[model samples]
Target: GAMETLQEGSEVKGIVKNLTDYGAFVDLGGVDGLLHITDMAWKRVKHPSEIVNVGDEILVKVLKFDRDRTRVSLGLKQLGEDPWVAIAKRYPEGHKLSGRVTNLTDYGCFVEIEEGVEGLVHVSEMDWTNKNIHPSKVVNVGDEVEVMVLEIDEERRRISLGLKQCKANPWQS
Candidate 1:
């Protein structure tokens, strides 16, 4: 009867029972539910530990319930605004803002312009002089930096950012 009380889209409060690389298992009184990492936050989360810990009480939304299998999917980020809905209006092209570097890759790095919102600064946009520099070389994770919004594809939920554009061009001097 544990699954009988839980309905999809309904909000429930539960205790974080355990954390894993994929997600956290929450004790929902009579049943356990999986709070997937992706549902933990809107921003990039490398690990579930970053948002929750064992024995913590948190609110979550029931995303899916499989009574036959005794499986439930929960979501925490659903409690807050998606932040991408009005992303274009808040961060239009040519807009300059400060952000923290969240990740780095061979091609580019991801910057968190705001909570639950991030943009990619491609390697080409990292510096004016270095055309093929690695993103890690330009910026490390947790570094705060300024960037210009190059483009925004709302439908795709993607934002192109440029770091060098925040500074005056040396060639122009």
Candidate 2:
């Protein structure tokens, strides 16, 4: 009876039972489904606790169900419209905008252009002169910086951004 109650594409209300770095375990009646960090929000999430807390009641969509294993995968962001839809028309190449730095990795940093929308600024694009510098040396999380939209891959939902392009090239001087 419990197995029949849950199906793919169905929406359910659940309470957050526990949180780990990868995902959150939610209690759906007597069943448990994993809400992965990527499915928690459209924006980049370093941990599950960033968007949800233990004991919080939330609605989630059943993304997958393995009948044999009785395992369920859930999604929270699925309930909302993906901002990337028709994003190319909104942010064309060379589009410059100010955004807050959301994350920084060894290779690059993520900048939030809007709520639930972010672009990646690779280390090579961080500065026109400093090609080998780490992202942290150029920008920190929460820093508001200007960025240029270099490329947009709608099929993959990736936006390549450039931070140095926002400023004049020193080599030209």
Candidate 3:
């Protein structure tokens, strides 16, 4: 109840109540705020489970507040240095590495190169010849696959990967 008096930019501590694909809900005493996926860490997050576990206490800053709706936006990344600052250096173009497929989408899938580090493998880059095939046909969650870093956009927090780049050309068959 006292949290209602908290204004934007106010610092407060909260306990993790639940998590969702997009974020985690934290209990702020009598109030609750969202700790979004992006706000959980400086590096990429495929899911909220990778960071804080439920029932954990965390400190966050109030990024937004709506007193009437009782909506509050919290951030944990704001307290840490941006990991993207060294992303390019860690995953340069042409670097070949193995990662586990973490998620699937119509446009692409995400692969975890490391803890809190995920990159996109666009469907278009899944194969050299099967340009029309869906990503699910090529890979699934928990599948370990090799990929080559195609592009790194630190500003956008995107790392483009290519599965075919690390695979033998099947078109030659």
Candidate 4:
């Protein structure tokens, strides 16, 4: 080592070398930083696997630097504002937008209403008349769809997006 030096609390970018059951060890130049799994997402993470894998490169904040022990602590979630903080102002309920389907699941498909904002097109919202059928049977991934923001739970950061609602409520249509 050339005795490299860096200021504490520096936002450093590094490659992940090892991931233990506790956290990820990042190779930050000459120092390895610890990125705890709790600092990975706005919502609860079931496991580190739900966020990242080994060999992943990411940016982190240096929270601690024990030069005496040559140890470092890093965090990723601290870098961004919690998306839930401004959910109400950004996408309020009754908002209408269009986007493409990114994925389909047993419950619903995820639609990218915007760059970072997404909503769920529940199976019940596939068509105005389709009933007792699977969502996949009605729509496929990569389909362009217009959706209405049914409900926006800013506190929970959960937006109930509906595709059929964009056209008609069906019950009244």
Best by lDDT: 1
Better of 1 and 4 by lDDT: 1
Clashing pairs in 1: none
In the range 83-172, model 3's lDDT, one tens digit per residue, is: 667877876889898988999887777998887678999888987766757889888989999999998787877778999888787657
lDDT of 2 by residue, 1-173 (tens): 23457778888888898998889988887778888899998777889888889999988888987666477888888888787886778878888889889888999999988876778999998987677789998889999999989987767777789999887767686
Ranking by lDDT: 1, 2, 3, 4
TM-score of each: 0.67, 0.64, 0.58, 0.57
Better of 2 and 4 by lDDT: 2
- Tell me the alpha-carbon RMSD of every candidate: 3.9, 4.4, 5.9, 6.3
The local lDDT score (0 to 100) that residue 41 gets in candidate 4 is 66
For model 1, the superposed segments whose C-alpha errors exceed 4 Å read 44-50, 67-69, 100-110, 123-145, 153-158, 169-173
Q: What value does the lDDT take at residue 20 in candidate 2? A: 88
Model 2 stretches astray by more than 4 angstroms: 1-3, 67-69, 94-96, 99-112, 120-148, 155-157, 162-173
| lDDT values for all models | 0.85, 0.84, 0.82, 0.71
- Could you tell me which 10 consecutive residues in candidate 4 have the lowest summed lDDT? 1-10
Question: For model 1, what is the alpha-carbon lDDT of residue 23?
Answer: 92
Query: Which TM-score value belongs to model 1?
Result: 0.67
lDDT of 2: 0.84
